[PDB]
Amino acid sequence: SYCYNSAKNSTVLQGVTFGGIPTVLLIDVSCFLFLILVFSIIRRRFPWLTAIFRLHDDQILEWCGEDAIHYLSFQRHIIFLLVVVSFLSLCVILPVNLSGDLLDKDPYSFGRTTIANLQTDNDLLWLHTIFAVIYLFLTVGFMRHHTQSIKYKEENLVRRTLFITGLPRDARKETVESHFRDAYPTCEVVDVQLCYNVAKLIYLCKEKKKTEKSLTYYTNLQVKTGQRTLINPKPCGQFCCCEVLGCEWEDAISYYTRMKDRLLERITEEERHVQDQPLGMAFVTFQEKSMATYILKDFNPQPSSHSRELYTSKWTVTFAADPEDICWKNLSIQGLRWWLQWLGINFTLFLGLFFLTTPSIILSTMDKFNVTKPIHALNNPIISQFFPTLLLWSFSALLPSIVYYSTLLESHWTKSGENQIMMTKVYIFLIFMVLILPSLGLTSLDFFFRWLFDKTSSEASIRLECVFLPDQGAFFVNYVIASAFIGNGMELLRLPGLILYTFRMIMAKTAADRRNVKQNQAFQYEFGAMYAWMLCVFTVIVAYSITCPIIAPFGLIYILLKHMVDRHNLYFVYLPAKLEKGIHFAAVNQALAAPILCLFWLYFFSFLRLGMKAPATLFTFLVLLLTILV
Q: Which residue ranges does the record annotate as region Gating helix?
């Protein structure tokens, strides 16, 4: 007498053969091995497994980048934490999940190993919650240790210049200087430089420099070949093989000369206009940092004779960044528009997340909507267990470039806030794209299915105690394996990278041009992107640790697959480390979110299964609140 009672001589449809995890795994590893085979061929063109069998931790610091050492230290800390949690979870909590009767002890159903196979009116889930908290301390300790592995000294002394926003457009340098003298007589200013709408000027000068580089290339090509080169200036104009209306061929030197002259005219126009358009922005540099900091905490003000006309109450004052990194070309989009521009991008990118992950989930349950005909209808094990998973992984792989385009479009101010904020906005969107939003989606899908089939269609309401993801949450398990074998081997071969390789070698000017292109063949290692990827998959793993612990070992494999691969990725192909120390600290403050999410989702599923009447729900609420506050 347990959930999934029966149908008329047809059993049930929701059950799956061990969530289909083995077969996809086999398929996955096959592709992985397939990829590694190609890898060998690639390395025979541009086994080396003995290298990873032989790599050591001294030569990497001896010659390669310094920050790669901290990245590998974080990788080692994560692998140790994951192996500890795997051997601590599969030992106790898997037998605890198996010691229940909601799945009727069916032979090869995934749900028998998940939290779904656990009585709601029990005390064993207390262990869950206890388990769900001890992780924190464990993880915290490990993360704390990793901090002591880098212990970067806090030195960011760029504080002699203050960036001030909210100044009136009619403000003058003399007036603001007099205001600072009056409000802060003990504080003396060396220089005030008002910011104007130069942005448009920057943009034009960037296009001039691009045009000149192009002109110099075609002039040097003529001089070398004696031939005039015709070009098509339309998008994709290289692929225009035929004189069709819209594929006009022009002389390259004549085109780029005319473009340069038109850009020069517009630059000279804009240079006259530059003052007329101030931003009400200001930079105030100082002899000493301490007076600037004094003004800063004072604002975080002292009246002057020039307080009223300068609208001092509307100013926002911060420490000015490095003058060589501040994006002037993105400073003209200040004001509420920027804030609106904010919502003008992420939200639509948010609406992107509903159009790439929701498909996959649908293919996961495209055969589980009739909630009847329960006679082994299911689907081919290739699809609905693997194909949606691979599709989700591929969309996640395409996401970081989309986030790069979005961050460029939203036009931030400081270049420093273009990689740390980049990593944060890739990690958050990845979490919202694989872990939280898809899980909520298919949990609500199971709610719909249960309302369609379980005791509601016949005479009553929903028996909500046995509510869980369809395939009993097998899907993310596949994802982890899809991120471990096919995903990691795929990342090893860098198919976007090799596509760029082939697309740059095929499209050229001369057949024998192997000298060029190869100069930019290798690219800088994007520590932010790979940190965000590892943290996204780690959140997917640890989030379902107290729940559906079969993922816990599989995710371990992932990080191992990652570890070795990134070692190779940090020795042979990709460039050495260059990034700053802030990214690693942010990544340290990133893994702490995974067990918090795990606690939140354990509480969420417990509250979904059983109401708030039981003291367990109240205990989960209070403990989640206190750990979140701390």
A: 475-506
Residue 4, in any domain of the structure: no
Co-location of 454 and 586 in the same domain: yes
**What's the CA gap between 420 and 417, in Å, rounded?**
6
For strands 278-286 and 189-196, give the pairing: antiparallel
Name the resolution in angstroms.
Answer: 3.8
Q: 68-98: b or e for each residue (b if 16 or more CB lie within 10 Å)?
A: bbbbbbbbebbbebbeebbebbeeebbebbe
* Angle between the N-to-C axes of helices 593-609 and 527-543, in degrees from 0 to 180, rounded to the nearest 10: 30
Contact 72, 566 (CB under 8 A): yes
Q: CA of 608: how far to CAs of 77, 101, 199, 463, 542, in Å?
A: 34, 19, 52, 11, 20
Same-domain check for residues 324 and 249:
yes
Q: Which residue bears the tokens 């003995």?
A: 50
User: How far is it between the farthest Cα atoms of the chain?
Assistant: 92
Provide the token pair at 373: 């005909």
Closest by Cα among 413, 505, 525, 388 to 24:
388
* Amino acid, single-letter form, for residue 380: N
The H or E element spanning position 164 is strand 161-165
